[PDB]
Design a protein around this nucleic acid. Structure first.
Ligand code: MG
Ligand code: MG
Ligand code: MG
Ligand code: MG
Ligand code: MG
Ligand code: MG
Ligand code: MG
Ligand code: MG
Ligand code: MG
Ligand code: MG
Ligand code: MG
Ligand code: MG
Ligand code: MG
Ligand code: MG
Ligand code: MG
Ligand code: MG
Ligand code: MG
Ligand code: MG
Lengths: 49, 106, 49
RNA sequence: GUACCCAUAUCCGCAGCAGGUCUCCAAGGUGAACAGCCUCUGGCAUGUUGGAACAAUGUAGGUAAGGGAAGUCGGCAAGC
RNA sequence: AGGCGGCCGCCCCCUCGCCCGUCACGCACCGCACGUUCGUGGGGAACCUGGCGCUAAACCAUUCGUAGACGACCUGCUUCUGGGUCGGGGUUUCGUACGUAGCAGAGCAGCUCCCUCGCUGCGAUCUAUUGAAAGUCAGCCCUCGACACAAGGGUUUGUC
């Protein structure tokens, strides 16, 4: 889903600086990645095999 | 292999959504027949005239949002169909709908 | 989510952000409240209590 | 001469064709009204098909922040 | 885009694995073509036998919505942390339900204890119960609360 963030912006040389800026911000749930396999590749003169 | 009788509170307001006005109360009864066929298992479903009145009591497009029903399963005789069982859905009235769940009626 | 295949500073990357407020309002409609305790403290007792 | 239809199915139009054809009887409410809308007597099964889903395009209908004709040959249509 | 080659040690034999000389035979098929080759050539369907192994997966049906014109695509299914239907809450949407009570209510009418805001009746609304009532997933969240269901089916698919 998506939420706001009230964020302090430390970017000098702008109207944006030293003020709070609300930005549209997505949330992506990322469970941990369980490792199973290993794949090897050979550089062929037609590509990758 | 039984002759059992249960009760349900079918939610017609969420079994009908996005359906037009002139074809709403028939889709209510098609969905009641499909719900009876799914629950009690037999394809033969007979619904009563009291349940007909209870569905069609408020026109074609103001279908009531929930109806308490009682599903009995009986056997068929006298040169019967290949489906020997049939679900006779009957209507039982109740004032309120909250805290009412599925009851096996003796 | 893939790592960027090129390297850029551009004053767009590597800024130590300061998150201040992330709203968790009712996204199922118009959100009025932040937390459940704050909603109960604003409204008060009902028939359920 | 005396039946029957007298019609979105008994007439004419090549047809059970949104076309055409002359008359009498007329209820209750709102309403100035035989206006429009809802009921009664009296008729009907939606007009030569049903079922499932609600894609583009279309045909009818309704809206839309701010501008208000800047579009267009022309305020055409729609709306006040 | 790999499969034959090289080394060590054994295995049953060869001391003709070859060049020159002697001897005699094998079809000498009597003039005739497509003969000799990497062929135990390529793949498919079956026949009898030895040894070593294998015991599945798609498609339909049902459900699903993250996708859908129809096809197509992402999904669930077990007898236990399985799904489905109700119910319960969480959220939200509108705005305070019916009923009851009121020395609230513009006022009006009637009665006699002759009633020192007397009582009764009509009466748009208002107040208290009331942030009430009602809907809430069908394309929202959690439920191990109550019922039932679960391997129940049809079609097809092999490499000397
Ligand atoms: Mg006559
Ligand atoms: Mg006609
Ligand atoms: Mg004609
Ligand atoms: Mg006509
Ligand atoms: Mg009248
Ligand atoms: Mg009048
Ligand atoms: Mg008249
Ligand atoms: Mg007709
Ligand atoms: Mg037609
Ligand atoms: Mg028909
Ligand atoms: Mg506008
Ligand atoms: Mg506007
Ligand atoms: Mg103007
Ligand atoms: Mg002008
Ligand atoms: Mg011009
Ligand atoms: Mg005009
Ligand atoms: Mg307008
Ligand atoms: Mg009401």
């Amino acid at each position: 889903g998506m939420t706001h963030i009230v964020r302090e912006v430390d970017r000098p040389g702008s109207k944006v600086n030293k003020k709070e800026v609300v930005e549209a911000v997505t949330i992506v749930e990322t469970p941990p990645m369980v490792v199973v396999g290993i794949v090897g590749y050979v550089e062929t003169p037609r590509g990758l095999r | 292999n039984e002759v059992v009788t249960r009760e349900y509170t079918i939610n017609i307001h969420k079994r009908i959504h996005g359906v037009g006005f002139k074809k709403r109360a028939p889709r209510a009864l098609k969905e009641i027949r499909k719900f009876a066929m799914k629950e009690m298992g037999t394809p033969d479903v007979r619904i009563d005239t009291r349940l007909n009145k209870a569905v069609w009591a408020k026109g074609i497009r103001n279908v009531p949002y929930r109806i308490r029903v009682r599903l009995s399963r009986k056997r068929n005789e006298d040169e019967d169909s290949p489906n020997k069982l049939y679900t006779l859905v009957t209507y039982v009235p109740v004032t309120t709908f909250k805290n009412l769940q599925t009851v096996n009626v003796d | 989510l893939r790592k960027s295949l090129l390297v850029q500073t551009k004053r767009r990357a590597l800024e130590k952000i300061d998150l201040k407020f992330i709203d968790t309002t009712s996204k199922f409609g118009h959100g009025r409240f932040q937390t459940m305790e704050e909603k109960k403290a604003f409204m008060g007792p009902l028939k359920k209590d």
